[model samples]
Target chain A: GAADKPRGFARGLDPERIIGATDSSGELMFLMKWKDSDEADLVLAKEANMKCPQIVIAFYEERLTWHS
Target chain B: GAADKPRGFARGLDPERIIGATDSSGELMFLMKWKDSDEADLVLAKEANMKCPQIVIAFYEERLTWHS
Candidate 1:
């Protein structure tokens, strides 16, 4: 009975990138693009310490693209 | 103080599409791409009734691309 399920694709679920910002409520809301799923989740910048700080940092690291 | 504030960009926040399926927990977890902000949100399939039903419908509508 266990063999009839959909393929396990969640293993690919990891923060890929942040495409936008968090507004209102004067809080830092970051958009997270997972490894392979468009289905994403958000995290406040303040919570990075408890959650994925690397991804949050990576979110802004994109600005380095402006660097020479 | 309003003059020193950042541009109000939240108007662009609207569910643009559902790019994946809601799996696990034996429930639904949808990924919603807002109009222009990757800083998005999620909605269980059942909650669409309290939220965006159109986007959810639009999500499945893509299935039509394979139709004729």
Candidate 2:
């Protein structure tokens, strides 16, 4: 339900400030800076449609970073 | 030298169409779709300061896909 979702969850983060974006072979890539670390977790969790701490933990464990 | 670099390489991909952008702990994240796979190669190589096929090949080899 929409109520279950957190505010600004669907929107994720701001689009105007995106540093870079591109599409390759039907895949999309984006580069941006989050306002805060906690915001990152919330946004990712919302997008993943999973619980906060779970997704947050996985993100840290993977230590994924995007470039170009 | 800038002459050695390919056109539209430094700017990399376009930023206007980015789906999302965020900053977390001084790190930035972006989500975008490249107009073409080949373009992705050129852009990555330009940004990486490496030769074309070399960087392009590495990208495909890694199969590094980005999401949200």
Candidate 3:
């Protein structure tokens, strides 16, 4: 059914896997850890850009823990 | 020593703790999970704005896992 077409790419992946996300002003920010690699597909990136021409993307691995 | 004065608030917290960060054009975006609480200090937020008058901040918790 068209109702189940899936809204966005990330949704097509894993909604539960998204550790964090937030909205400031009007920009949308989200954090997702890839299952295999942190690198994103070029085609997908291009597609994302087409959807939101004004977007900021970043990738990072490793978590920081506090002491004391 | 002035060198040990700490550059930014986040740096004062924990460098490795920052899971993600990026610089787009000139704006900075970061993903961080608080050790105890996901909320940030308003004073620190105001201080941050003082440093960079233009900034966007967001906070979120709960990891999203995928289904096969």
Candidate 4:
């Protein structure tokens, strides 16, 4: 459920959504859908709304972090 | 982010907050309010909270099991 939910959250966004994720390598990976580039950038730069269902608990105990 | 941070960790407690979650089948779901409901059900059942944060990693991780 955790895995599926997180993927769903990513999909639920606008197609042009900017997506940022931490890879197993521990590097921050940033992705953008091209259309909403600016919005995506802002979103990526911010700590993801950890209060949101999809982000905070989806990994079910995974350590999640925020950007400035 | 992950569906808006698990409904703001279920509205950050304070209510009778007797929330429970399950699925399209019969199962056990329990929710309680109290920054410490047994200290908070041992902070709600022996789980949740990441190591770097203020609470036990297992404690915060408990949020993952509800409903979903």
Scored by TM-score, the top model is 1
| Model 2 residue B42 lDDT score | 22
lDDT tens digits by residue: candidate 2, B1-68 = 75766554344654222233345535443333345433322223223223232223233324445478
lDDT against the true structure, per candidate, is: 0.52, 0.36, 0.34, 0.34
Query: Candidate 2 on A3-68: residue-level lDDT in tens?
Result: 675444454544222233345534433333344533332222223222232222233324435463
Give candidate 3's whole-model lDDT: 0.34
**Model 4: per-residue Cα lDDT over A1-68, one tens digit each:** 65653332354554333343433343323343334334443233123323232333333334322222
| Model 2: residue A68 alpha-carbon error in angstroms | 22
Evaluate model 4 with DockQ and give the value: 0.04
lDDT of 3 at A7: 38
Instruction: Please estimate how well model 4 matches the true structure, expressed as its whole-model Cα lDDT.
Output: 0.34
Q: Which regions of candidate 2 deviate over 4 angstroms? A: A7-9, A15-33, A42-68, B1-44, B47-68
Candidate 3 chain A worst ten-residue window by lDDT: A56-65
Candidates ranked, most accurate by lDDT first: 1, 2, 3, 4
Q: By TM-score, highest first, what's the ranking?
A: 1, 4, 2, 3
List fnat per candidate, in order.
0.00, 0.00, 0.00, 0.00
lDDT of 2: 0.36
**Strongest candidate by DockQ:** 2
TM-score of the second chain, each candidate in turn, equals 0.60, 0.24, 0.25, 0.21
> In order, what DockQ does each candidate have?
0.02, 0.06, 0.04, 0.04
Q: How many residue pairs clash in model 2?
A: 19
